[PDB]
Design a protein around this nucleic acid. Structure first.
Lengths: 129, 98, 49, 49, 126
RNA sequence: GAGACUUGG
RNA sequence: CCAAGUCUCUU
């Protein structure tokens, strides 16, 4: 459980690209070994079944878009600020008539903004669920 | 790092004696892999002027270098030269004397 | 460029120039807008087209 | 322009820009001090480009 | 209702300070002393606890160097975090963080690390 | 980062 | 195997 504090801060859990690239590489290798797009599809679906099932009942649109399109969020985004190599962005949004502010950080402007929007979405869901 | 070490030592001594207090202005500069200029650990500093330009401008009068200024770097004619560490190379001896 | 540097010169200068105490009032920001703004909008876009 | 004694200087800023404009203001202070020192400590015999 | 400049800037730097602290688990320049003088932190530390720790370190009632180590830690009202570090050594190579406002971190092999901190504090308390 | 170059050890 | 400096070039 995250500790208690004053500023609702968040950052981006960096996702290495090597994982996705290697998964694609294994798919390509499976295809080349079998030379059967039918078998390739079999394995791909065996891999993807949970996410295919989940996404159908809910399509994740870009996180910033999700926050913007939400009916009762009404987000507001502050200007970026640079201190050394940290870039900051604060989001101001409303929930259940109480206005809540959350703060995000990233290596650059875009990442900090995305992390702020993501944190706002997490808090919004926690209030929704 | 001997430059910076001895430079700090001279700063202490200069602010240790009455007769040398307001006559000597130590300044040190080294080559590449530029050692930090400060003793504060605050990531940025407010002073901007460079040491070589200071000595050229007379702001600093006491220079602590290591075989950097011996070649090339133009400097006004200097009254005294102190080779703290023993002489090793003929060419460097000639240039330091010059 | 040339300028005053002496502390006596400094204090002589502050006789005429002053350092004004400077504060920073802020205000809550709201984005909710009224319908009449939408109406005026629609009218102006109709006029533009 | 707030040249009078005990003059008061007030900044109106929306909350969501509060941090950014604080940053900008203190950047201005830093720049001002830098100009002041660069003029003070600087010495030149030629005093002409 | 008046809103001064300085406090907001203090908070501006405070926010980034907190972010650094969280992401890097301390190790920020949290201590206020100058780096060169910061070394004296542990004796600017409370004198009552100082003399208590002197008594504890000069005591010999402890069955084990372990016992004495964390008894000194309690006397000093600190809770060091001890964690192991991957090493080629057959003996586990341990690491300890004192978790205090001054980021002080050490390693040593299990056998000597307790003696290592014991000596570290025999030195530091001075 | 990679190093490279000169000098010396 | 050690220093210094240099240079191209990384932060």
């Amino acid at each position: 459980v995250p500790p208690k504090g004053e500023f609702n801060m968040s950052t981006n859990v960096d996702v290495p690209k090597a994982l996705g690239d290697v998964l694609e590489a294994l798919i390509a290798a499976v295809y080349l070994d079998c030379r059967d797009l039918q078998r390739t599809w079999e394995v791909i679906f065996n891999l993807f079944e949970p996410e295919l099932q989940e996404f159908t009942r809910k399509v994740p649109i870009n996180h910033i878009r999700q926050l913007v399109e939400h009916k009762h969020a009404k987000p507001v985004f502050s200007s970026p600020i640079v201190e050394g190599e940290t870039v900051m962005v604060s989001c101001q949004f409303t929930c259940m008539e109480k206005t809540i502010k959350v703060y995000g950080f990233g290596s650059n402007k875009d990442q900090a903004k995305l992390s702020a929007a993501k944190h706002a979405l997490q808090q919004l869901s926690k209030c929704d669920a | 790092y001997t430059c910076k070490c001895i430079y700090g030592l001279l700063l202490n001594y200069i602010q240790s004696t009455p007769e040398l207090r307001n006559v000597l202005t130590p300044q040190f500069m080294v080559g590449r892999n530029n050692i930090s200029p400060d003793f504060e650990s605050v990531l940025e500093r407010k002073w901007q002027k460079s040491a070589i330009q200071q000595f050229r401008d007379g702001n600093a009068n006491l220079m602590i270098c290591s075989s950097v200024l011996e070649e090339g770097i133009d400097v006004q004619a200097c009254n005294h030269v102190f080779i703290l560490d023993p002489v090793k190379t003929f060419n460097m001896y000639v240039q330091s004397k010059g | 460029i040339i300028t005053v540097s002496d502390t006596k010169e400094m204090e002589n200068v502050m006789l005429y120039a002053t350092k004004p105490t400077e504060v920073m009032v802020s205000f809550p920001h709201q984005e909710q807008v009224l319908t009449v703004t939408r109406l005026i909008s629609a009218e102006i876009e109709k006029f533009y087209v | 322009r707030a040249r009078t004694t005990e003059a008061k200087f007030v900044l109106f800023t929306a909350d969501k820009e509060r941090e950014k404009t604080i940053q900008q203001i203190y950047q201005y202070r830093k720049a001002h001090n830098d100009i002041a020192e660069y003029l003070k400590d600087r010495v030149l015999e030629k005093t002409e480009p | 209702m008046e809103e001064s400049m300085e406090e907001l800037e203090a908070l501006r730097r405070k926010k980034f300070t907190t972010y650094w602290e969280l992401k890097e688990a301390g190790s920020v320049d949290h201590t206020g002393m100058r780096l060169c003088d910061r070394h004296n932190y542990f004796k600017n530390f409370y004198p009552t606890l100082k003399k208590e720790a002197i008594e504890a370190i000069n005591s010999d009632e402890y069955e084990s160097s372990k016992d004495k180590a964390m008894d000194v830690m309690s006397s000093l009202k600190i809770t060091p975090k001890i964690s192991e570090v991957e090493s080629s050594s057959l003996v586990p190579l341990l690491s300890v963080e004192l978790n205090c406002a001054f980021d002080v971190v050490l390693m040593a092999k299990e056998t000597d690390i307790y003696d290592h901190i014991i000596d570290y504090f025999r030195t530091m308390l001075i």
